[PDB]
Structure formats: C-alpha cells, structure tokens
Symmetry: C5
Subunit: 158 residues, 5 copies
Amino acid sequence: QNYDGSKLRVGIIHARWNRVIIDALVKGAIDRMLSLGVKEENIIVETVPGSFELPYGSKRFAEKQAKKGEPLDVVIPIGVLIKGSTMHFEYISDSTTQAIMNLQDKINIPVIFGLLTCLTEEQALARAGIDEGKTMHNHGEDWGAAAVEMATKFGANA
Amino acid sequence: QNYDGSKLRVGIIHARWNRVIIDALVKGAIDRMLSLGVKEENIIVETVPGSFELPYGSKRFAEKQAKKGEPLDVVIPIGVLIKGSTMHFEYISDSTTQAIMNLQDKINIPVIFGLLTCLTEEQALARAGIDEGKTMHNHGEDWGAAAVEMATKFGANA
Amino acid sequence: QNYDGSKLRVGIIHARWNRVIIDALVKGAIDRMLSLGVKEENIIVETVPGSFELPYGSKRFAEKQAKKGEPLDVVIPIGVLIKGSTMHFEYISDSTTQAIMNLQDKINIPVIFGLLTCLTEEQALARAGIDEGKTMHNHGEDWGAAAVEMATKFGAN
Amino acid sequence: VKGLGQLDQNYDGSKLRVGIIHARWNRVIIDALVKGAIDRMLSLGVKEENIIVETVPGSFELPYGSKRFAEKQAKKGEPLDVVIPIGVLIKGSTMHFEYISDSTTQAIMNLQDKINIPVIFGLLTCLTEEQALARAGIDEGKTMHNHGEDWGAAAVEMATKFGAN
Amino acid sequence: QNYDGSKLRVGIIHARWNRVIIDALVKGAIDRMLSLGVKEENIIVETVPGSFELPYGSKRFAEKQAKKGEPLDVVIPIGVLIKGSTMHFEYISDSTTQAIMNLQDKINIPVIFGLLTCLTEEQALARAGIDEGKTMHNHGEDWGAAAVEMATKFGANA
Ligand SMILES: Cc1nc2c(=O)[nH]c(=O)nc-2n(C[C@H](O)[C@H](O)[C@H](O)CO)c1C
C-alpha cells in the first residue's frame, strides 16, 4: 500500500554522539516522511545527549506534546552506538533497545527503532548512506516510512 | 490430537523483509490451518515493515479486530531475521522475542512465535521448506498447527 | 527434611519435541512425587507443542484448574531444547526462562523450571538418566522433589 | 561542600531482623557463605534470634522463595528488614548455568519493589569450583576472603540507611 | 543550548568498590554541574556498598528526599565494574543497567547511567580521566552535563 502522512504529527528525538552520522539518519527520515505527505511543520525534532537518554527522553517528549495539545502520532528515537574497547556498547544497546520496545505501551503510539548498533564506524556510515563507497542505503529513510505506515495503519483512529 | 479449528479466527501478521521466505512461511501456516478446519475467511492477514514492528502491530491488530466485533482467537507474528555484519540482528531478535512472549498477557490470547532468527539466508530457506535441497520442512506449518491447538485447548472457554 | 505431598495437587505440563527425553523426565518427576506421597489422581499432565508455549500454557492450565474447583498447588513446565545451527535455541531459551520465572507472581504458585537447555542430544539424554553410560541421575526427579518442597513450604496455607 | 567524602563508618544492626535463604546445591560452599554472612552481622550488632534462615532446593527457587519467606515473616508479625538469598552456580557443560543465572539475577533485582525491602545479591556465578571455593574463603590457598561477610555487611547497611523508618 | 542548572537539586549515589576511580567520576560530575549553575548546597551525595545496590538505593534516596520536602530533579548512580575471572561482572552489569533504565518511570525523574563496565582497571582509569597518559576524558563530566539537560528539558515542570 501507499500510506499518506498528511494528517500525522511525527516526533524525532536523537542523541548527539556521532553527530555526522546522526544528522544523515535524521535527514533521510525527514525527506522520506515529507515524500509521503507528512507536513514540514508537523515533524518535531528533539534531542538528548546519549542513546541511554532516548527512552525516557521519548516518553517525556510525547507527554509534553500531548499536554500542549499537539500529540505525536509516532516517535522515532535515533541513536548511533559503535562498539568501543569496553562492554559499554553492549549494556547501553541492550537496555536501550528493550526500553524503546516497552515504551510503546506506556505512551500508546508506535515507536520506531532508530538505533544503529555497529561494530565499526564504517558500518554506521554505510547504514546512513554516507560511506565513501555508498555501499548500502540510508536506514533513516526506512524509519521515516515505517513511522508513517505504523501511525496510519495502527493509530487510535485506525 | 485432532483439534477442530472450524470455530477459530486467526490473525497472521508478517514483516515484509525477506519477502519470498515470508510468503512461503505464511502460505505454510495457512494451509495447515485450513487442513485443521479453520475457514479461509477467518484467517486475517496483516503486515508491518520489520520484525521490530511485529509486537505493537500484533497488539493493535488484536485490539482493532475485537473492536469491530471480529476478535482474533490467536495471532501468529511472522518475521525473518538473518545475521548481518552489525549487532542489529541480535538486538532486534532478542527484544522482539521477549515482546512476543509478553504480549500474550496484554491481549489474553496465545501468540505463536513465528520469527526465524538465522545466521544465513540458506538456513532461512530450509526452514521455510524452500532451499534447493528440501532438507528440512516449512516451519510455518508448525506455527499454523500450534495456533489451532493453543486457541482450542487454552481458549477463553476452557 | 521429609516433605509430605499427600495433600498436593501438582500440574506437569510439557512440550512434545524430543519426546523420548520428555517422557523420561516426566516419569522421574511423577515417580519421585509418588514416593513423597503425592497421590496419582492429583498429578495432572497437560501438553503443548513447543517450549515457547510453556509459559502461556502453564498460565491457562492453572486458571482452568482453579476454575473447575481443582486448583494446582505447583506447576512443572518441562521442555527440551537442543542447540541447532540457527539462534532459535538461544531466543526460545532466554524468553521461555524469564517467562517461567515471571509466571509465579501471576498465578501465585511456585513454578518448577523443567527446561533442558542442551548443546547436544547426548547432554539432554544424560540429564534424563538415559544416555548409554548412565552418567547422571534423572533431573525430572529433582523437579518432582522441588515441586513438593516449594508447595509445602511456600504455599498459601 | 556537598553531601560527600569518605568516613568508612560502621552500621548498627541491632534493631534489624534479617532473612537468609539459601539453595542446597554445592552445600559446602553454601554453608561457608552463610556462616560468614551470619558472623559479620553478629559483629555488627544483629542479634542471633533475629537472623532467620530458610532454604530452597536450587537457585531458580530463590526469588519466589524469598518473596514467600518475607510475606510469611510479615504475616506472623516478624517482618524482615532485608533478605539475603544465597546460591552457588558453577558453569557445567550445557547452557543451564547461563539461563538460571540470568533469570535469577534479574528476578532478585526485581523482587525488591514487590516486597519493599532491600535484597542482597548472594549468588555466586563461577566458571569453576575453585573460583567458588575461593569466594567463600575456603580454597586450599585461602586466596581471597569470604564474600558471605560482605553480604552480611551490605544487608545491615541497606536496611539501616534505606529502611522505611 | 545553554542550560541553567541553578534551580536543580541533583542526587549522586555511588558504589564503594574502586573508590579512587569513583571519586574522580563524582568530582567530574559535580564540577560540571557547578559550571552549569547547579548550587553546591543542592548537590547531595549518597553511597551504597556495590553496584547491585544502586538501583534500589537510588529509589529509596529519591523517596527519602521527596518525603522531607527536598525532592531530587535527577539522580546519577555511579559505579565502577571491572571484569574478573568469574561471570559476576556480566550478571551485576546486566541486571543493574536494566534496573537503572527502568527506575526512571518508578520515581518519575531522569536517571543518568554512570556505570563503567570495563574489561580492565586501565580502561576505567582512562574513563575517569586519571590514567597515567590521560588518553580520554572524565566521563563523570558527561554525566553531570546530562543530568542538567535531562532535568531542565524533560522535568515535570516544563
Ligand atoms: C564481585 C563484585 N564486583 C563489584 C564491582 O566490580 N563493582 C561494584 O561496584 N560492585 C561489585 N560487587 C558488589 C555487588 O555489586 C553487590 O554489593 C553484592 O553482590 C551484594 O548485593 C561485587 C560483589
């Protein structure tokens, strides 16, 4: 099917580590959502320092929007995790992915998983469409489409 | 046992990555359910973009069906995950698996675990019964049988 | 100590993959509870197809028993998982284990962890007391004993 | 300045009732861990008649057993202020070690909000017997010290510092 | 953006193992928050015996604070875990990280993840800024900056 996002308000909340890669992911989510009809002033962008802040950050972002009379239909937390020499990578990835999944029932809208969990920087670049070789595609576009489809097919109105 | 599936309504909801494999798994579940007496018109199929979308999809899918007076007796979320070069496979698989298990208590019907979590494409083909050498069998068929058994034996009425 | 099991009703519910190992585990559980005085007619056995079905099957098994006025005091879900070549073993094991643990607080009775999580068939056989060399005691027996002790010592009464 | 700096003070255990509940596999290790936790708490002023000991067959039983232990103690007017569940797990050749450890750890952690008292993590998760003997202060070489004593101290401190009163 | 922390009350609660590294992490968080404007008299430091005690110590820390009329706006649990030769490291780290993440909804303030999960003491010293060759930076500072931002941006009040 072809999903029309013209009636949606979408939230994007991103972490600020690996900023270049973050900015490419967020751009591709935006471009793709506009392409499917979401209005520009209905894409709300918020930020937090690290990926661990994404879930509580997303919950409070959604509550704040609802309280001011501008509820989100869907949220895309975006973060980039690259394995370092410690186990920090594993513990942030694990607890964050699980809390992003469990957030959906707290706030009652879908939440799109926009975390990269890469072993290398180069893998993160390819997944954002910004490697030298352009060897894959920008995953942020996948997240934008999925946000439009999940909000449309499964929103309260559906 | 023989379980009479003629009274059941059953939802299938599938991700849309690895589509050829998905269709074969889906087709396997439907056929087996049809052979246990489930009626063609009582099998409802829905889709989501990726495996991470399955659990919230499945929740909203059940709620929607109940709300129009057509409640699902059991749901079979289906996705195919194949290990790539980052840890995205691990983190999707594990959070999606836990969310599928836990969904059962939120919607009060059995949810059949229809995710493949393969290290290679070929393992995934074999488990959909469509590798060149037909070395295994279509797991879809197992999911289909299990959906009818779990709905019947453990359905809201004994 | 000796735990008297004569007043207990115990449910065993088991998956059906690896049936020979399953039957040996269930028989050891039942034999040990018989010898702890649990009565034969108060041992109720149910099945499910796969280990993944154990936690929701056990919940509805307990509910149904309570609803017909024959509540279980304790339940033993039993399944046999053997590592294969995909990660399916790991995901089933991890999510089934945690859900068996979390089940206790929902149905308010102990639930005995009767799940083998083996890398080979021969490990599973051994843990059922039926490998060729008889290298280990049947773990089903321990599950039977644990069910009687947990129900007796930690039961509502 | 802030709330901080380092004083290393003792905590008085004398108003406390403490529960220790232990698995029965690897009994010799278990007995040494328990004795150490009891000894250290007696040294901190917990009275002998206020240390309650209970057992369960294996480590997987520690979480629900600890819950029902604390509920029973409260129902007879003898509430626990803190519980120490103790078990010894040693890697075997299947993945049983890992599934039991992980789901037991997580349920000891989660148990605290249900019964509303601290729960000290008294589980050994060792790759070898030797590792477990050492952390109970009973290897040949006495290479370490009895982690049991740390659990007893940790219990007295958590109950005292963070108790309802 | 620039954050004004002058209205904030922040709790720091640290384990006792690897005290020298804990102390450096804690001073880095305090120094950072001071420079963001938090006042000294509004920073409260508590201690627990080990990393395992952080989540429940944090919960009770926040509840005691609120009950005497001085509620925290954010809490920063700090611990330093180093792999040893048993699986103790993995079990503490995993259950502690997940419980710190999940604490946030129980006490309704953000909780910054101040655990080091290091393979070696050397990694830990580097991440508290006190290794011999000063190779990284004091991560306690990122935590302080995170506490101020999450509290300001996502606090109950605004
Ligand atoms: C072995 C060990 N290692 C650490 C560590 O590296 N860092 C730390 O902060 N705490 C450790 N602990 C203590 C546990 O976190 C906890 O206090 C005990 O197991 C009692 O619950 C223990 C027990």
